[PDB]
Symmetry: C2
Subunit: 194 residues, 2 copies
């Protein structure tokens, strides 16, 4: 069973590179996976449910990598620490642009997609705030904005900026400049006096 599910998921990710989910049919997905339409419906209720699963897989991948990072002793310098951290988002989502793009669009129409994304964001925002607090506690960063509010805006910047870059949106930061850009804003706003 898991093999057919995997093939449906691989097909959907391949087709999402070429067109939106609205222009991909259940027949398209079934054909690509080498199954019939009713066999498709045994594994997934809808093509939307397929996207939800793909998004869950990509988000889980980012989460697992961020968890490994958090578990290693911190950084080398503070700037490099944050670069390595933001890089996990850049590489994970940038390696699944089609799913990322589709998932972002789906948040507006799907409560499940919206909740999946919200849970992920809340977790890594809370982590970011805890890190900022610890930096302040050790005298490495000044006590400026409430850490959770600062953490929220910075992560939301990362979300919008990375996703615009991946998609080549007009306007966007070039993908090759996006890491340096975000890192600068993080380091200045976290460690800068104000």
């Amino acid at each position: 069973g898991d093999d057919r599910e995997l093939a449906i998921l691989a097909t959907a990710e391949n087709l999402l590179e070429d067109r939106p989910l609205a222009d991909i049919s259940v027949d398209d997905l079934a054909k690509g996976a080498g199954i019939s339409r009713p066999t498709f419906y045994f594994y997934f209720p809808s093509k939307e449910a397929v996207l939800l699963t793909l998004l869950d897989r990509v988000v889980n991948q980012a989460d697992m990598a961020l968890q490994t990072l958090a578990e290693n002793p911190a950084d080398t310098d503070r700037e490099n620490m944050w670069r390595t951290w933001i890089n996990v988002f850049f590489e994970t989502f940038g390696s699944h642009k089609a799913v990322t793009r589709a998932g972002q669009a789906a948040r507006a129409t799907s409560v499940e997609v919206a909740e999946l994304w919200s849970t992920f964001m809340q977790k890594w925002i809370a982590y970011t705030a805890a890190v900022i607090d610890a930096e302040r506690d050790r005298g490495a960063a000044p006590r400026t904005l409430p850490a959770h509010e600062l953490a929220t805006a910075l992560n939301l910047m990362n979300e919008r900026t990375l996703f615009a870059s991946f998609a080549g949106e007009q306007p966007s930061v070039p993908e090759a400049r996006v890491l340096d850009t975000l890192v600068h804003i993080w380091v200045t706003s976290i460690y800068g006096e104000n």
Copy 2:
């Protein structure tokens, strides 16, 4: 003619407070405006076209206010200058939350909405970069990131952060804290050494 158009537009904005565009019908819009369905279709081809016009009106309102600001002699202090500037976006879009929310959703499905927003963003990003350049030229700010790339990320942060706040998204910065948050990030990233 302009009166009936105005009434259609007022109705659409009122109904968008309560439900998405997908749950508002042409009959809903016609009834609210005191017109028939075919009279509606004389003024607008679709309910989507109604949203496009509403979004155009709100965006133009922000643009006109930003143009007035740009035309006045600059600031008092640098932080206050940026606060007053970002405030135009906060007040203009925050005074039309329903249309803002609907328009953001529509970017994914409408090339016209996507182009309207892109033109606006490109203009005020270019303006922001020009201001950063001038600050550097006068020795008020250090030459760090390329000004246009920095300007792009900061404006994209503002977009995502304001719109999440307006909508009470989880996660979001509280609406009452959003200005202070964005201003801090702008001032530190623009004027901070790095």
